[PDB]
Amino acid sequence: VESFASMLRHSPLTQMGPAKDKLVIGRIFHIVENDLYIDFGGKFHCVCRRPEVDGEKYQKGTRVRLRLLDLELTSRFLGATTDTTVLEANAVLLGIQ
Amino acid sequence: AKHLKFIARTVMVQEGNVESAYRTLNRILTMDGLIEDIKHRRYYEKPCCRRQRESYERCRRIYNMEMARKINFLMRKNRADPWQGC
Amino acid sequence: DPPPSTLLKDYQNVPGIEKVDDVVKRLLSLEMANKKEMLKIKQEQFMKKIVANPEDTRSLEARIIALSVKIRSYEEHLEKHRKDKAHKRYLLMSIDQRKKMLKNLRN
Amino acid sequence: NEDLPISMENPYKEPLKKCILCGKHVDYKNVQLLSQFVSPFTGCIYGRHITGLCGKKQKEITKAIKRAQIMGFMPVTYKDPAYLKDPKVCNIRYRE
Amino acid sequence: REVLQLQEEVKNFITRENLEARVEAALDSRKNYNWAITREGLVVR
Amino acid sequence: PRYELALILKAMQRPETAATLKRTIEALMDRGAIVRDLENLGERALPYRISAHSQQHNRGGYFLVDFYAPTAAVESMVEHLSRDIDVIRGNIVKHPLTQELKECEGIVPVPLAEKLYSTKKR
Amino acid sequence: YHEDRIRAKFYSVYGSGQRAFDLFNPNFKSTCQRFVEKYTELQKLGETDEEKLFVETGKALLA
Amino acid sequence: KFSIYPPIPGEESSLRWAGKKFEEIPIAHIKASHNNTQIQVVSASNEPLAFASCGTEGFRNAKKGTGIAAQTAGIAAAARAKQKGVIHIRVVVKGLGPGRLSAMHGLIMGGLEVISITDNTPIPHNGCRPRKARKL
Amino acid sequence: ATPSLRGRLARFGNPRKPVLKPNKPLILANRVGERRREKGEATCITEMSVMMACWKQNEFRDDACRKEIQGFLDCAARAQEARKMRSIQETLGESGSLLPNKLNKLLQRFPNKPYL
Amino acid sequence: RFMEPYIFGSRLDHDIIDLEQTATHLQLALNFTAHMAYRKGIILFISRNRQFSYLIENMARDCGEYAHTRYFRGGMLTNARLLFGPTVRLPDLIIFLHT
RNA sequence: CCAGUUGACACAAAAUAGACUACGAAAGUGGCUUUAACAUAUCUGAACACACAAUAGCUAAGACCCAAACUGGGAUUAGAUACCCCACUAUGCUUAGCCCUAAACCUCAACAGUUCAACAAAACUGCUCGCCAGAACACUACGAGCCACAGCUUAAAACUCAAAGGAC
Ligand SMILES: [Mg+2]
Ligand SMILES: [Mg+2]
Ligand SMILES: [Mg+2]
Ligand SMILES: [Mg+2]
Ligand SMILES: [Mg+2]
Ligand SMILES: [Mg+2]
Ligand SMILES: [Mg+2]
Ligand SMILES: [Mg+2]
Ligand SMILES: [Mg+2]
Ligand SMILES: [Zn+2]
């Protein structure tokens, strides 16, 4: 049990601040049937499919750069007084290394 | 019988493509509501009924916009299962 | 019955229109405004003639003078274009408020 | 003290979200400029959200447009072919 | 300052140096702001 | 508020229009109307005429007479304008160039509906 | 946090976050994170002007 | 490419489409409705020549408003116009009904080339008030 | 996006005039519009009409309307095929987009949480 | 509503919970679960989100507890006398892994 | 005078923007120039008075191509002052002698505030006047007020009963 203030201050999710146009690198947390849900900390992980340019290096423990765009994805529809979450992020993929 | 009618709602046709100009005119009538204008001015509708119909049209437009937004927002999941464990 | 042609109440401390031609002063005198100018004239005159602390429009006596000026303005407005019932009801409510304020004062 | 969450002055503030009239008052004495916001066939104006303006903004804009149409500062029935193309000010809903 | 600005602008209205000539120019000459605009603040005809 | 006149007439000779404009300016200066600028929108003319009632205006000019009236003279000015002959659609205007639209900065986000029906099922 | 203004200035004056961030292991470090840490170390104790040190660090990292 | 606005002969014609100005291209006034049509093909010199109906074929009931009678009348008018020379025309439409697109297709198939649909439908811009509701 | 409806509400708050008067329960759902077809179509009859016209202009048999007779045959065939293709694609199983039930399930994946 | 006391703050539509409260809750819950397993306390796991059902089931296998990461049919705990035996000790502790 | 390109006579009617936000105690409104435009900002305090008219109507009339109350002639018609086709008379725009009733509903009063019989416009208390605690008779006979003389504010008492009403 160390200092609670410093630990709450210096943290990855808090150090990255408001994720917006930030190239983040990470690995895949779980192989998908035919997708490519690559993780990278933050609050959620991106969602996409395997790219045509080099789509084999993606392994459980790799390092591929992302873009991080909208880590919330929510919108009050019609009468839903609350929000409708999707647990996604959706970001433009760059490549490998 | 008042002004030059060759310029009022006179869409040009290119290469005899009357279908394109006709489709543009129909889209104009629909969006702007000129067909609706004719249908509503041809005969009378109670001002109470008119306001109720306007409110119903606003409600229908809101419903259609929300449906389109929900479709465009949830079409992102058109992929596959994430885990497939339970 | 305040005077018709006078000087501006707000533009009183401006010597840049006193020693000038006619149109320059007219642009900043009683000509381009409306009945509000006559209302301000009446307010200033009655405040200088009655209360010892003019230019206020907030205190008790100032509020009463403002209400009286508003009633006079509504009367003068109804003097012309009598085909307006909304303004008639406005004047009726103004007279009711005048009665209420006078009663509260006397009591 | 400093390592605790303290509400600051709320950074990441975008400037005045201006729509199109950032600082250029459109003139109501022209053909091309006044017809840009009007259809060159029936004299119709585009929606409020289509132009991206606010409430009072687009309200006064369309009021001035109708004033120009009526008083005689712009042709309402149509537009002269002299002023051909029009910049993409209001997202045209037809033809495209 | 506003009164001084108005006094200075009064000379820019219809001074005696441009009375009949001004009417002649208005009846013959041109002086319009015929300029189109786009989504942004750009000048174009 | 301020005023603004846009005298729309035809291209009828020239000395007659000049004399009429001179007379109008002299009358406005002698009465109590301050004239701002006497600009002009060229020889522009709408491609379509007017549904007149009681004339036929094809080609005409746009002689502006940016003037400012006090209060008890708008009717007299309208009468003096109607006293003319060739007029498309005489209609005084209120100077909108100086002060733009009302006080409004930019766009604001539209609020969402918060609880419009009872929480049950329906 | 106090680093909000620092990040805002860093991303407004210069480009957005272009460095690859891991964010898996705790208190990870890279280049932009190292710059933020250096800024926090140089803050406060400035008073005069922090833009000077900001531009100095930016030019040292870029050239 | 190709301006959408029609250059009227006054303000302003500048090209010669197949050696024919805008005024040289006559009009094709048609009364499009659910009942019948009154075609009118003008000449190059601004003179009417053609005029076909629907009941003349043999029908007299609501069958005249169908597309068959409209197309036949359009073909007859196109033939009457070509008898003296017209070729180009300006399609017109007045009202709504099955004879709207059918008349245009008939005019197109009658050998006449269309270049500008100068349709002038009856759109009373805030004029005649509405009448009592009736089953249309 | 949506029209103004803050003050214009028939509630105890703002005593303004209500604008939106929804006769139906304005509550989102997870079901696409109703499926429908066949009511007052009577389409694809121009070929048959021109064939009948050509036959009436001549006599009864096919002598100068071979083009019209083959057009009528092709029109009947294509009309049957088009009715079938409509009832299939335009109603239920499509080929290019998603199906009605598929879209309904996709919307149901994330319904709503109105009870907070 | 009852989650506001725990939710300390937020980071742009992202709630943050105090670490001390979560640590104390974890300590208490783990102590209770351990002292319950000290008497064969049948612990029951639940996780229908499919996020980590595999790992939860593997951990339950490695230990002596059980999991209910599948559909809840006609009463699995309130009506466990028909679908199962009559004398069956029901779970005395349920650790909702993903409620 | 049917389809109009070169034009034509109404106290009409607000084509998309009207998807906009307002005042008025509430009626009430949207294509334009001008006169005058938003009362007190502590609340309430007359259904024995000053005024509005929602829409309509009696009397004196002006008056808009454009609408119907009186309408004729014909699908259907067994029996149709409506339905399916033409327009028209009191009236829609204007000044006066007038009942001011409504679904003048947003059936939810103004201020101080705080956090579910069922249908649901969420719950909890103070302040001011109004309401009733048998229906049909009883938006009525009769009485009081109105220049209404078919009505308006109030508007009761007899024989019948287990009531009656609303929701689920
Ligand atoms: Mg309903
Ligand atoms: Mg009270
Ligand atoms: Mg009282
Ligand atoms: Mg009334
Ligand atoms: Mg009538
Ligand atoms: Mg009549
Ligand atoms: Mg009117
Ligand atoms: Mg009453
Ligand atoms: Mg009512
Ligand atoms: Zn703007």
Residue I116's closest chain F neighbor by CA? F119
Taking the CA of residue D71 and the C1' sugar atom of nucleotide K17, their distance in angstroms comes to 18
Which bases along strand K come within 7 Å of a protein CB atom? 2-10, 12-29, 31-41, 45, 50-53, 65-68, 83-85, 87, 92, 94-96, 106-110, 116, 119-122
Domain assignments of chain D as residue spans, ordered by start: 1-96
Identify the sign of the CA torsion G11, G14, G19, G25.
negative
Residue among J44, J88, J83, J89 nearest J67 (CA) = J44
Q: Tell me the H-state helices in F7-115.
A: 15-31, 74-82
**Amino acid in the structure at residue I50:** V
Residue D45's closest chain B neighbor by CA? B32
| Cβ-based contacts of G27 with chain A (< 8 Å) | 10-12, 15
Is residue A92 within 8 Å of residue A67, measured between CB atoms?
yes
Report the C-alpha gap between F117 and I115 in whole angstroms.
11
First to last CA, chain F: 55
Rg value, chain C, Cα: 16
Residue to mutate among F34, F94, F98, with most C CBs inside 10 A, is F34
First to last CA, chain C: 29
For residue C89, the Cα-to-chain-centroid distance in whole angstroms is: 20
Q: Tell me the H-state helices in D1-96.
A: 32-36, 48-51, 55-71
| Cβ-based contacts of B78 with chain I (< 8 Å) | 98, 106
Residue with tokens 């533009």: C11
Is residue A80 within 8 Å of residue A38, measured between CB atoms?
no
- What's the token pair of residue C25? 């002063």
Residue with tokens 């809750």: J25
Q: Supply angle C-alpha J8, J13, J19, rounded to 5.
A: 25
Taking the CA of residue G16 and the C1' sugar atom of nucleotide K132, their distance in angstroms comes to 73
Is residue F76 within 8 Å of residue F27, measured between CB atoms?
no
Report the C-alpha gap between H8 and H10 in whole angstroms.
5
Is residue G12 within 8 Å of residue A18, measured between CB atoms?
no
Using DSSP's 3-state secondary structure scheme, residue I81 falls into: helix
Q: Are strands F5-7 and F63-65 parallel, antiparallel or unpaired?
A: antiparallel
Nearest to A82 among I26, I27, I113 (CB): I113
Phi, psi of I97 (to 5 degrees): -130, -165
Contact B41 H124 (CB under 8 A): yes
D67 closest-nt by C1' vs CA: K32
DSSP annotation of I2 reads: P
- The β-bridge partners of A26 are A64
Report the C-alpha gap between F57 and F9 in whole angstroms.
8
Ligand 9 centroid to Cα of residue I26, in Å, is: 27
Rounded to the nearest 10 degrees, what angle do helices G32-41 and G50-62 cross at? 150
Taking the CA of residue H91 and the C1' sugar atom of nucleotide K24, their distance in angstroms comes to 53
What is the least distance, in Å, from the CA of H6 to any CA of chain D? 7
Report the C-alpha gap between A91 and G17 in whole angstroms.
14
Chains that touch J (3 or more CB pairs under 8 A): A, B
- The β-bridge partners of F67 are F35
**Amino acid in the structure at residue C79:** E
Contact A8 D12 (CB under 8 A): no
Nearest to B27 among D42, D77, D94 (CB): D94
| Cβ-based contacts of E26 with chain F (< 8 Å) | 21, 38-40, 63-64
What is the least distance, in Å, from the CA of I115 to any CA of chain A? 8
The DSSP code sequence of B18-61 is HHHHHHHHHHHIIIIIHHHHHHHHSB---HHHHHHHHHHHHHHH
Residue among A25, A69, A43 nearest G31 (CA) = A25
J1 closest-nt by C1' vs CA: K115
Residue F61's closest chain E neighbor by CA? E27
D77 closest-nt by C1' vs CA: K15
Residue D4's closest chain A neighbor by CA? A5
Residue with tokens 């079901």: I31
Residue with tokens 């930016």: G58
Ligand 3 centroid to Cα of residue C93, in Å, is: 14
Phi, psi of J90 (to 5 degrees): -75, 160
- The β-bridge partners of J16 are J9
Nearest to D79 among H5, H7, H12 (CB): H5
What is the least distance, in Å, from the CA of H15 to any CA of chain I? 38
Report the C-alpha gap between H20 and H44 in whole angstroms.
9
Using DSSP's 3-state secondary structure scheme, residue D92 falls into: coil
| Chain A residues 58-87 with CB within 8 Å of chain F | 76, 79, 81
- What's the token pair of residue H117? 């649909």
- What's the token pair of residue D11? 């950074």
Does C86 contact chain F (CB < 8 Å)? Answer: no
Is residue A54 within 8 Å of residue A39, measured between CB atoms?
no
Residue among F12, F45, F39 nearest E26 (CA) = F39
Report the C-alpha gap between B74 and B60 in whole angstroms.
21
Using DSSP's 3-state secondary structure scheme, residue H114 falls into: strand
J27: part of which helix (H) or strand (E)? Answer: helix J19-37
DSSP annotation of H68 reads: H
Residue with tokens 């679908």: J83
In this structure, the number of other CB atoms found within 10 A of the CB of residue C73 comes to 17
Q: What are the residues whose beta carbons fall under 8 Å from the beta carbon of H48, sequence distance 6 or more?
A: H40, H41, H42
Is residue A17 within 8 Å of residue A68, measured between CB atoms?
no
Residue F52's closest chain B neighbor by CA? B2
Rounded to the nearest 10 degrees, what angle do helices H67-82 and I46-58 cross at? 60
Ligand 2 centroid to Cα of residue G31, in Å, is: 72
What is the least distance, in Å, from the CA of I106 to any CA of chain F? 22
Does A77 contact chain B (CB < 8 Å)? Answer: yes
Chains that touch A (3 or more CB pairs under 8 A): B, D, F, G, I, J
Half-sphere exposure of J8 (CA within 13 A, CB side): 12
Is residue E5 within 8 Å of residue C16, measured between CB atoms?
no
- The β-bridge partners of F93 are F4
Is residue A83 within 8 Å of residue A38, measured between CB atoms?
no
For residue D77, the Cα-to-chain-centroid distance in whole angstroms is: 21
Report the C-alpha gap between F46 and B7 in whole angstroms.
12
Nearest to F113 among I5, I25, I115 (CB): I5
Residue with tokens 């100095």: G56
Chains that touch I (3 or more CB pairs under 8 A): A, B, F, H
Report the C-alpha gap between A97 and F112 in whole angstroms.
43
Contact D3 A18 (CB under 8 A): no
Residue among D85, I7, I103, D5 nearest J12 (CA) = D5
H117: part of which helix (H) or strand (E)? Answer: strand H116-117
| Cβ-based contacts of A9 with chain D (< 8 Å) | 3-4
Residue among F47, F51, F57 nearest F84 (CA) = F57
Report the C-alpha gap between H122 and D72 in whole angstroms.
23
- Topology of F2-94 in CATH? Alpha-Beta Plaits (3.30.70)
The DSSP code sequence of chain G is -THHHHHHHHHHHS-S--S-B--SSTT---SHHHHHHHHHHTSSS--S-HHHHHHHHHHHHH-
Report the C-alpha gap between J60 and J69 in whole angstroms.
11
Residue among F6, F18, F16, F12 nearest E23 (CA) = F18
Phi, psi of B20 (to 5 degrees): -65, -50
Number of domains within chain H? 1
For residue D18, the Cα-to-chain-centroid distance in whole angstroms is: 11
- What's the token pair of residue J43? 């612990």
- What's the token pair of residue D78? 């149509």
Peptide bond preceding F54: is omega within 30 degrees of 0, i.e. cis? yes
CA distances J18 to A7, A33, J23, J98, Å, are 11, 37, 9, 20
For residue J56, the Cα-to-chain-centroid distance in whole angstroms is: 10
